[PDB]
Design a binder for this molecule. Structure first.
Ligand SMILES: CCN(/C=C/N(C)C)C(=O)CNCc1cc(C(=O)O)ccn1
Ligand SMILES: [Mn+2]
Ligand code: NI
Ligand code: NI
Ligand code: NI
Ligand SMILES: [Zn+2]
Length: 337
C-alpha cells in the first residue's frame, strides 16, 4: 500500500523540480519513503562522460564488514587518493568485478552471502557535479529549495561505486529529502522502510545493537548498520525493493530509512533538499549525540518564516505537533482540488 512508485514526467512536467515533487506527494509517493523518477528520453545532464578520467577521488573508503545472520557493521578505512581512471581499472578487474547473474534475486543473494569478503573500495562523498553548467532541469548542484535558507547540505556529492559497495540503513541528516541521479554504469539497488514504520526499524536495530544504542541516541546516522531483507521479513518490518538504472532519479523522503548496494562500476550524484513539510521533521529529528562533527541545522529561521504563529511556543518547548507521515506537503494542495 506504501509501495515504491515510479514516475514518467513529460519534459513540460519535468522542468519545475519543486512542483513535481509536490505532484508525486499528491500521488502518495512519500509514503514508501522512496520513489523513482524516470526523466524524458531527450534529456541528458551531460553530453559525454569521456572527459572525467582525471577527476580525483581524494578519500576512497574500503568497506570492511563484520557480522552474521543478516546483521552487520560496516567500517571505513580511508585509502590514498586516486583518479576515476585508477578506480575504474580496479572496479573492473577480475578481483572486484560483478559476478555472473541472470535475475536480480541471484545478485542480491550473492551480495548478502559475500558482503564480508573481499572488501571493496567506494569513491563516496566526493564534492562535485557532473551536470554541465547550463542544465536547468533537476540540477542537483542548485535546486534552490527552501533548504537554501540555511560545500554543504545543499551542495552536490558524487559516488563512484563498484560491485558490492554499500550504503547502510539511515535517514538523511535532519531527516531531509534527498535526490540521487545515477549518471552512468551498472545499477544501484535500494531498500526502503515507509516513514510510518521507521521507529519499528529503530526498535529492532536498538535490540540488536544495544551497546551502540546506549552510546548514541541515533547511532544509525553513523551509517554503519547493515540489515538484510530476510531479517526485516523475520521481524515483520515492512519494506520494499527497487533497482535504479543509469539515467534514473531516486527521491528519498523525510524520515524514510533506506539502504542498498551497487552492482558494479557506476557514478551517482546526490544532495539534500527541503519542502515546507520537512520543517516539522527537522524540528523533531533525533540527532547523533556522540560525535561533535555531525550535521545540525538551526531550525529557527524556518520556524520564524513559515511557522511564525508557533515560534514562541516552539522556543518554550511546548510545540507538541504530531507528525502524520501520510500527509502530502502543502504545496501539493493544487493537485488535490
Ligand atoms: C545527500 C548526499 N549525502 C551526503 C551527506 N554528507 C555529505 C555525507 C548522503 O549522505 C545521502 N545519504 C547516503 C546515501 C548514500 C548512497 C550511496 O552511496 O549511493 C545512497 C543513498 N544515501
Ligand atoms: Mn541517503
Ligand atoms: Ni566513463
Ligand atoms: Ni592505500
Ligand atoms: Ni553492540
Ligand atoms: Zn552518534
Amino acid at each position: 500500500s506504501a509501495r515504491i512508485m515510479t514516475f514518467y514526467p513529460t519534459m513540460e512536467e519535468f522542468r519545475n523540480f519543486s512542483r513535481y515533487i509536490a505532484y508525486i506527494e499528491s500521488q502518495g509517493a512519500h509514503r514508501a519513503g522512496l520513489a523513482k523518477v524516470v526523466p524524458p528520453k531527450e534529456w541528458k545532464p551531460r553530453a559525454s562522460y569521456d572527459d572525467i578520467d582525471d577527476l580525483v577521488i581524494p578519500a576512497p573508503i574500503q568497506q570492511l564488514v563484520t557480522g552474521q545472520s543478516g546483521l552487520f557493521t560496516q567500517y571505513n578505512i580511508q585509502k590514498k587518493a586516486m583518479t576515476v581512471r585508477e578506480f575504474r581499472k580496479i572496479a573492473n578487474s577480475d578481483k572486484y568485478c560483478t559476478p555472473r547473474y541472470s535475475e536480480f534475486e541471484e545478485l542480491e543473494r550473492k551480495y548478502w552471502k559475500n558482503l564480508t569478503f573481499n572488501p571493496p573500495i567506494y569513491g563516496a562523498d566526493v564534492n562535485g557535479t557532473l551536470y554541465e553548467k547550463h542544465v536547468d532541469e533537476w540540477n542537483i548542484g542548485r535546486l534552490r529549495t527552501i533548504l537554501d535558507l540555511v560545500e554543504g547540505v545543499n551542495t552536490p556529492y558524487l559516488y563512484f561505486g563498484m560491485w558490492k559497495t554499500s550504503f547502510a540503513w539511515h535517514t538523511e541528516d535532519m531527516d531531509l529529502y534527498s535526490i540521487n541521479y545515477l549518471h552512468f554504469g551498472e545499477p544501484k539497488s535500494w531498500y526502503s522502510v515507509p516513514p510510518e514504520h521507521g521507529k519499528r526499524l529503530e526498535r529492532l536495530a536498538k535490540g540488536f545493537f544495544p551497546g551502540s544504542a546506549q552510546s548514541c541516541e541515533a547511532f544509525l546516522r553513523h551509517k554503519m548498520t547493515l540489515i538484510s531483507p530476510l531479517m526485516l521479513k523475520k521481524y515483520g518490518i515492512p519494506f520494499d525493493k527497487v533497482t535504479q538504472e543509469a539515467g534514473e532519479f531516486m527521491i528519498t523522503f523525510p524520515y524514510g530509512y533506506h539502504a542498498g548496494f551497487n552492482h558494479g562500476f557506476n557514478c551517482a550524484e546526490s544532495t539534500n533538499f527541503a519542502t515546507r513539510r520537512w520543517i516539522e521533521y527537522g524540528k523533531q529529528a533525533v540527532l547523533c549525540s556522540c560525535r561533535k562533527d555531525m550535521v545540525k541545522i538551526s531550525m529557527d529561521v524556518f520556524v520564524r518564516k513559515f511557522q511564525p504563529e508557533r515560534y514562541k511556543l516552539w522556543k518554550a518547548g511546548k510545540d507538541n505537533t504530531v507528525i502524520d507521515h501520510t500527509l502530502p506537503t502543502p504545496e501539493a494542495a493544487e493537485f488535490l482540488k
